[PDB]
């Protein structure tokens, strides 16, 4: 009983529907490799170092899915890099076919095999139990769609059905904006949270199970990913810890023209409204609230610089180690700074908002991750002498996206045209494919 | 004009008297060195790795600078190892002193001459121009009686007599509680803040003249000391940045048996009266704040254990190569980022309430303290290196104060004799000449 297509809902709730499709607005695609070079380096033997940009509107999660060179060109429903998982933050055909399928189901197979399935916007069924004879009347019905975000929620004493109103909106948002991981043979979403949410929890959580995402393909570090941990940085924060939802400032109350009440469904940044965001709990004008949000920003920008440049010296001072003969046990303690140092650092800064949710909480893990990192390149410095080598590590040149996609032994002119192939031709397909099934309208 | 005899007001503002005479409560002595013995190894070669206790009442100003082993035993007025600059923050006689005698003449000489002239405890007269009609007659009449902090406010381009109200009452607090230097023969004090307040601001005037307060005797590099930057610290936060002033939080306006208001004169703990301080502004209870002003200082406590571990290895790293026969030059740049290490680090928790002023820019402040640790170990790693050293290089037993002022060679048992001689000695003496003198009743 998931319905997907989310037009169905747009005459019953035309305020809610056309303000949540008014994200196709928020439609520039910031490339965040070419801002910062040095993350093709550290992400260097991942696909985050083939593409990477800037969150845009929940009305592009699935044509960003389906562009990202991260997810390859498959050629039949058992090809391609990545899994089912990637699809699950993406679109309520997610919510549809772990109902129709099962969990285990869904997970099963390649990101390719749900191409033909996985079809409608992010949208009503991802955070609303549209099922239910309330909704129709106007009331939000708020629920967990997706069983790993409740398992989770669970697993930090927050099961959702015990959590009151104000808990429940964040929660909604916490299905996917979190960090996570694929656990088990079928790659299935889990979020880290066993142990608790901080840097310090997750780390000593993935390094109990000897879970690796990649391996640096520089330094050769089994390395761990962080993604997006809005859920858990925006607990550690001032706002979080005095239940400020993630509603309060991305999805406020507004009027309509006839002035009735209703949640503003276009997300995105809350100073686009500051009259019915900030401006509700604070007295300080827009620019003065701006201006501090950009300071953290900045201070955030400049620290993170500080501790990307000693990772990128890292790895490279590692690949020269590998290249005057370091063997895998020499190595080791070396990989085990780099890992943890990039660790603290990735999940620092890959919510794109931690200036503003919990800046101090962000500023504290890249102090964390600088900390590894000077014990990374001492031991480094120690083993390079060994081998007879006394002299600084020299970079090759990174100074844009593309000399350092071409650094690390990407061939992006193939990589791309392969792309740029399989969007023109086998997106199309997947669109009729679920139109004649009526999965698409 | 200036009266250092605070008692003479205790009739005319009994209120306001009873409470400043009350900082006497707040009594207890720390030993932050017996906490933390890190801090004779970072400040090896200083007085502040002889004795290094946390602040407590004002009424103790006078007895803690008299007492500390820092400012040693002196056998007469033209000995001992500390100027005259010492005293400056801790009685109203300076300003009688700076008055009487100008201030090049209060600056000329060593600590040992000021001691039967300055025997008044903080307060009236350091903060108020008591000689104004106005100021029997209740009304505070603020000022600054220390003409170098006149300049420091007039160098952020705040002149005091021109700031309102508000701005003054920090004003008068930022006499003292900042960070300083000794300028010239003279040992003038002097706030580094020509070029702003920042740590970069700071750091970048203090190369520009090329000061240094002392050398670091395992390390030999040329350091700088940071002192307790609350003024600094309080503007970069955000109560600074919402002209929550100093005495919102630690004067708060309180009512006398009688009903009639007064600013409390019990400076402390702003907690001690939450109803009349953060209550002021805040809904939330006295232990929520609590609980995130304590989370805040176990962050901070945290991080700055990790700098100051890599900072101890960095001077210890730099005696090994040192003795190994490293020269001036090759020394030099290592020298540069442990001295940039250091300073950053020092001005980050110099300050005791700086995770309750600006937590977020202490955190900043800390992670680009390590990055500079990272450089400096790196750096003599590859030196050691080229001296035939690649092994990591041992660090003494530093796990207690007492262990850490053997390994860098204070003879403490003989310090501290030769200090309680003096103490049960030279300050009757001088006392007995102050009275004399009519300067003490
Ligand atoms: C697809 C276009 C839809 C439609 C038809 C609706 N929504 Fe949402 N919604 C979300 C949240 C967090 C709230 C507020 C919850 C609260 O106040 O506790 C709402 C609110 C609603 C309502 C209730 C009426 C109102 O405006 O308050 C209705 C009828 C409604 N919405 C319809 C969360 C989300 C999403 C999270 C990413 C998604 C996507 C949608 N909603 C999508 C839609
Ligand atoms: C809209 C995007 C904003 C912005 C820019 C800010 N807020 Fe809030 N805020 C709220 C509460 C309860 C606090 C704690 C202080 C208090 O008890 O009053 C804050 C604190 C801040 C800060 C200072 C904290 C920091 O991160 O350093 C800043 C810069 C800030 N806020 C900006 C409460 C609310 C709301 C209540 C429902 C809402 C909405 C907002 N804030 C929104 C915003
Ligand atoms: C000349 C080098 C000296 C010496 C020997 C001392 N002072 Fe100061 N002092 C100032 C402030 C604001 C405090 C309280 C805040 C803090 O310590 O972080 C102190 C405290 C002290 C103490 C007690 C604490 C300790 O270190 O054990 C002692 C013994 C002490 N001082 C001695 C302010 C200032 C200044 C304001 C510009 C100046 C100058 C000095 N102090 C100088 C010295
Ligand atoms: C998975 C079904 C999601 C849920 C539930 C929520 N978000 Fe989301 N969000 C998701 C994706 C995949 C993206 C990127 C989309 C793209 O193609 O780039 C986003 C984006 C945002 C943004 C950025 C918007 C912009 O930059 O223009 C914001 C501020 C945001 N999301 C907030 C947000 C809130 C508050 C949520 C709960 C109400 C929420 N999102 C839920 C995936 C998912
Ligand atoms: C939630 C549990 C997710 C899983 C599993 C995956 N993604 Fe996602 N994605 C998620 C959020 C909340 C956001 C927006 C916030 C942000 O910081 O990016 C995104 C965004 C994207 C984007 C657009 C931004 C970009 O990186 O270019 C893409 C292309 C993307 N996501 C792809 C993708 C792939 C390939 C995944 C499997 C590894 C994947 N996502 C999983 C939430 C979640
Ligand atoms: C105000 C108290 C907020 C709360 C609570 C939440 N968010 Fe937020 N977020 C807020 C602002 C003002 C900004 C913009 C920062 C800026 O420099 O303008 C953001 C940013 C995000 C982002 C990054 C989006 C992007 O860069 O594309 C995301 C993905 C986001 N916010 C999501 C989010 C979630 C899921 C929240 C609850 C966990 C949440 N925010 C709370 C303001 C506030
Ligand atoms: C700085 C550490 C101070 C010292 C030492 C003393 N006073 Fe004070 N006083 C100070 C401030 C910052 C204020 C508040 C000014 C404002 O704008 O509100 C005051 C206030 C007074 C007043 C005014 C009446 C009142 O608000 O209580 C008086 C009469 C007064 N102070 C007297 C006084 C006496 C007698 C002192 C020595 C025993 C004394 N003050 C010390 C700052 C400081
Ligand atoms: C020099 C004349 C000062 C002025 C003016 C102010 N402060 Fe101060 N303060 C000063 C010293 C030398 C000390 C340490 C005293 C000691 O012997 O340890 C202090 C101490 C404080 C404290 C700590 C109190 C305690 O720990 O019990 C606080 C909270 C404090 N000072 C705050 C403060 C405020 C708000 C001021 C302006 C009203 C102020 N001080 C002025 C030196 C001087
Ligand atoms: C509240 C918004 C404050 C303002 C503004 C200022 N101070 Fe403060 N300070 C405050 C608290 C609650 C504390 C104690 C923190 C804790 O862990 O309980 C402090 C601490 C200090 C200290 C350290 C005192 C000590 O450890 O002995 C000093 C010296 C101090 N505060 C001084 C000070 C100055 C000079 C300020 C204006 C520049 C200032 N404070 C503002 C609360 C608040
Ligand atoms: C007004 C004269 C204040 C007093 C007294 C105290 N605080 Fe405050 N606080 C005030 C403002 C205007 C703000 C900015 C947020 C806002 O409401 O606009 C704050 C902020 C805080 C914070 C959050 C920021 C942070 O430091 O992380 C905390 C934790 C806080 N305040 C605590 C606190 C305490 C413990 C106080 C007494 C010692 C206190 N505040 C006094 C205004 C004022
Ligand atoms: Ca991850
Ligand atoms: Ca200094
Ligand atoms: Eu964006
Ligand atoms: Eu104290
Ligand atoms: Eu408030
Ligand atoms: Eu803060």
Redesign the interface.
């Known amino acids: 009983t998931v319905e997907a297509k989310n037009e169905t809902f747009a005459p019953q709730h035309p305020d809610q529907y056309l303000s949540w499709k008014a994200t196709s607005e928020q439609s520039e695609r910031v490339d965040a490799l070419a801002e910062d070079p040095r993350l093709v380096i550290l992400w260097a033997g991942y696909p985050f170092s083939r593409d990477y940009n800037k969150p845009r509107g929940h009305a592009f999660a699935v044509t960003d899915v389906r562009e990202t060179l991260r997810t390859g060109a498959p050629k039949n429903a058992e090809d391609g890099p990545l899994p089912m998982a990637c699809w699950s933050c993406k679109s309520p055909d997610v919510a549809r076919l772990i109902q129709k399928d099962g969990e285990d189901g869904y997970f099963h197979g390649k990101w390719a095999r749900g191409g033909p399935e996985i079809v409608n916007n992010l949208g009503c069924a991802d955070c609303h139990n549209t099922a239910s004879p309330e909704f129709a009347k106007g009331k939000p019905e708020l629920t967990l769609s997706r069983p790993y975000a409740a398992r989770a929620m669970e697993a930090i004493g927050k099961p959702f059905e015990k959590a009151g109103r104000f808990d429940q909106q964040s929660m909604v948002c916490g299905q996917c904006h979190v960090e996570y991981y694929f656990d088990g043979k079928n790659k299935a979403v889990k979020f880290p949270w066993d142990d608790g949410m901080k840097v310090e929890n997750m780390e000593q959580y993935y390094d109990k199970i000897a879970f690796s995402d990649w391996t640096n393909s520089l330094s050769k570090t089994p390395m761990l990913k962080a993604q997006h941990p809005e859920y858990e940085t925006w607990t550690a924060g001032?706002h979080g810890?005095?239940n400020v939802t993630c509603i309060d400032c991305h999805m406020p109350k507004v009027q309509n023209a006839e002035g009735k009440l209703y949640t503003d469904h276009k997300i995105g940044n809350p100073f686009d409204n500051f009259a019915q965001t900030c401006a509700n709990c604070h007295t300080?004008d827009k620019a003065a609230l701006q201006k501090?949000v950009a300071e953290?920003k900045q201070?955030i920008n400049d620290?993170k610089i500080?501790?990307e440049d000693?990772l990128v010296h890292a790895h490279f001072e590692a690949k020269a180690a590998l290249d005057a003969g370091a063997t895998e046990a020499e190595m080791k303690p070396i990989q085990d700074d780099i890992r943890h140092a990039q660790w603290r650092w990735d999940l620092a800064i890959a919510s794109h908002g931690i200036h503003m949710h919990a800046?101090?909480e962000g500023?504290?893990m890249?102090?964390?991750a600088?900390?590894k990192?000077?014990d990374a390149?001492?031991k480094?410095?120690?083993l390079?002498?060994?081998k007879g080598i006394?002299?600084?590590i020299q970079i090759p040149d990174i100074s844009t996206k593309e000399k350092a996609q071409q650094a690390i032994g990407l061939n992006m002119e193939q990589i791309k045209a392969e792309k740029q192939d399989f969007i023109k031709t086998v997106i199309p397909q997947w669109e009729e494919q679920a139109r004649k099934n009526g999965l698409l309208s």
Chains 1, 2 share one sequence.
């Open positions: 001032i810890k005095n300080q501090v953290r201070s620290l500080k501790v000693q800046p101090e500023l504290r890249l102090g964390t600088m900390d990192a000077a390149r001492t480094l410095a120690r390079l002498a060994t006394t002299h600084e």
